[PDB]
Design a binder for this molecule. Structure first.
Ligand code: HEM
Ligand code: HEM
Ligand SMILES: O=C(NCCCn1ccnc1)N[C@]12C[C@H]3C[C@H](C[C@H](C3)C1)C2
Ligand SMILES: O=C(NCCCn1ccnc1)N[C@]12C[C@H]3C[C@H](C[C@H](C3)C1)C2
Lengths: 372, 373
């Protein structure tokens, strides 16, 4: 561990480095990672690689704050200190977090869910209908990105005409206008619900939180799922032959892909974690991408198994900040794989996957496939 | 004023709308501007167009906070509330403001000012030597942008080889964080090192951008606007070019006239009256130095450009505790550029109408096509 820099992004250029986290889990489940030239803020942090200790952190939001602690001016939930701490739902503590989470949730109505589902089924059908069997194409650009971006446009009440403003961005001006329109005439969408309850800055952070959940996190689960099934063709065949297995399979996709593999917190008081003495103000990073392959908890943790049960993965978090979009993500994955696997039992990856170079997101930038 | 929206940027796309602000000074020096669809946050604000009241706000930083007030979560010094309030020098209050201000000015050493000056003189001479007389060219892109960007690169300690990251932004984020890390590893004789080695990466980046803004936006705009004004006033151009002893007075007039940073926001921290109106804690207050700088109660012939204007107690660099730390650097940029240009050229023709930036926070020219002879 002394020689491994978890802030050196070159270690993440080829995917999540499971082999380095095996070392971390074995040698030091909780340890103090000194800063290097790559480390945000020039400051060390506690690094947590195992499941039980990761959950200890997640389940104690008072001790392990999503805002700040000690004399630290601001923290948040990424390793770099950010002044947006406190001002966006994921970087918020109680009592404000409970209120705002209730407000956001109030906008995820049964009708919105059906609106998303109806659009997703039509769109996924159309996209998969236009695939040329056996012809190579980039699955990330042509399919994986499109579906969840349209979902988030529907949640945010972005008119169909204006969705180009969002896509081209993967903006501020358009979002502020969209925000002012909804204050003017409230509309039946989540951006309207939050805008008519907050500053424009807070609204824009919310906007980007969800644009990120779709554009990035959900897209990455989709592409990663296709790659995992491509690597496990026997499992692909089993799954396509009985979609009753799909909900269980989707959970394994999220555990395996862990698209959001790390979180930061800030200790608010002295505390002992994994036998280590944490001080008020210090940064703690948990690695759900490592917890999710902890062999203390998951049998054959380094194998993809679409039947895995139980599957208590931390891919959508755990506790008070648990992913509000978890079921939307599941719905995207379910519909996409129904339409894809109904059509195609052969998935060949024809160039090596190109990964995003990040320790905050595990994502595939390009995945060139042929479907038959 | 009932039919005027000072938050509608269509009103600022052609320069600062001096006509609207003459109406504002006449009708209601201080008044409550209701929000429109263009108004940040959907919230009204007090708008302050006259010199006396502008000055009064600037000079009372306890009442008129640069952070927040009342129950408001965060404010800052633009109309939109920003969560960077409290975390960058200009959006800070005492006691932290004083500490950080002194830190930053400790880096404006005589040797740094010399480094800037020696570079400026060389580059300004190079650039003007390169001009083809009579041939049209974009003064903003070719000259007015270049000089002050080089200045702020010197202040922040950006190696000449990495200066393109900044020019191409006007990728930078990533570069700035590596530059910050390098100043922590190996302290250098520059302003960024001084601040880095006294703060989070965020805070340092916000400081980096503050100075970057100061150079690439505000100083650039003074230079381009100063040339436009001289072009519009050719007799004064001639008088100036005959006697460079007039330059210091002229430069103050350039700053008054151009008012490159023509508005500021504050947040009231307590109940107070301004211009005979009651302000309550939490309420936004926007002052318009661009307007104050043409208030006829203070400036004779206020709507006329006069290079000899004395006195000239303009608010173009602020006033009170947040007064521009770069005032002498901006004046130096202006002085060298106009020495060098007016030495060579007594004829300045603007050949395409000026293209203005669309903003009520900055008054600046995006393109200014000139011929010099
Ligand atoms: C496969 C896709 C997704 C994954 C893996 C994922 C993962 C996560 C995780 C790990 C957290 C916990 C954050 C923390 O502990 O600090 C979270 C929170 C959150 N997610 Fe997702 N997410 C996904 C999709 C979405 C979608 C589509 C939405 C759209 C509604 C969404 C909205 C949210 C929100 C609003 C939070 C913050 C909840 C709170 O702090 O109370 N997520 N997500
Ligand atoms: C013609 C060019 C410039 C103009 C018109 C200008 C204008 C201003 C104004 C109006 C303020 C007051 C802000 C407030 O009251 O909220 C200010 C502050 C400031 N200026 Fe400039 N500026 C110019 C160039 C520069 C330069 C070249 C620097 C480089 C050091 C600079 C550095 C600063 C700093 C650091 C502050 C904040 C000081 C504080 O908050 O304590 N400015 N400037
Ligand atoms: O914090 C997140 N995403 C959390 C992890 C991914 N996710 C999103 C929803 N479910 C999972 N995103 C932002 C995006 C912008 C705006 C704010 C603050 C900074 C900058 C980061 C939020
Ligand atoms: O606040 C200013 N500029 C003040 C007026 C221009 N100026 C600068 C120095 N003298 C004059 N700039 C920032 C630039 C970035 C980073 C912080 C906060 C936001 C976003 C705005 C500062």
């Amino acid at each position: 561990l002394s020689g491994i820099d978890l802030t050196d992004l070159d270690n993440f250029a080829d995917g999540f480095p499971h082999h380095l986290f095996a070392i971390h889990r074995r040698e030091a489940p909780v340890y103090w990672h000194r800063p290097t030239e790559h480390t945000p803020d020039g400051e060390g942090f506690w690094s947590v690689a195992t499941y039980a200790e990761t959950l200890e952190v997640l389940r104690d939001p008072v001790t392990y704050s999503s805002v700040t602690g000690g004399q630290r001016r601001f923290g948040g939930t990424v390793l770099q200190d950010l002044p947006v701490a406190g001002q966006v739902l994921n970087m918020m503590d109680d009592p404000r977090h409970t209120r705002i989470r209730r407000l956001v949730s109030s906008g995820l109505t049964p009708r919105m869910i059906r609106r998303v589902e109806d659009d997703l089924r039509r769109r996924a059908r159309g996209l998969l209908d236009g695939v040329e069997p056996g012809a190579p194409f980039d699955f990330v650009v042509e399919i994986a990105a499109e579906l969840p971006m349209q979902m988030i446009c529907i949640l945010l009440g972005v008119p169909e005409t204006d969705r180009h403003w969002l896509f081209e961005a993967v903006l501020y001006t358009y979002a502020l206008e969209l925000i002012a329109g909804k204050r003017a005439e409230p509309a039946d969408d989540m951006l309207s619900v939050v805008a008519n309850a907050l500053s424009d800055a807070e609204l824009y952070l919310f906007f980007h939180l969800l644009f990120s959940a779709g554009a990035e996190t959900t897209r990455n689960s989709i592409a990663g799922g296709l790659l995992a099934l491509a690597e496990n063709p026997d499992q692909l065949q089993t799954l396509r032959s009985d979609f009753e297995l799909l909900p269980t399979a989707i959970e394994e996709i999220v555990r395996w892909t862990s698209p959001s593999p790390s979180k930061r917190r800030t200790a608010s008081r002295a505390v002992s974690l994994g036998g280590q003495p944490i001080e008020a103000g210090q940064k703690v990073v948990v690695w759900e991408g490592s917890a999710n392959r902890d062999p203390s908890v998951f049998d054959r943790a380094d194998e993809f198994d679409i039947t895995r049960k139980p599957n208590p993965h931390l891919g959508f978090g755990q506790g008070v900040h648990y992913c509000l979009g978890a079921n939307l993500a599941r719905l995207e994955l379910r519909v996409l794989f129904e339409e894809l696997l109904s059509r195609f039992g052969s998935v060949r990856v024809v160039e090596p996957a190109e990964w995003t170079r990040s320790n905050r997101h595990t994502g595939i930038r390009h995945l060139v496939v042929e479907l038959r």
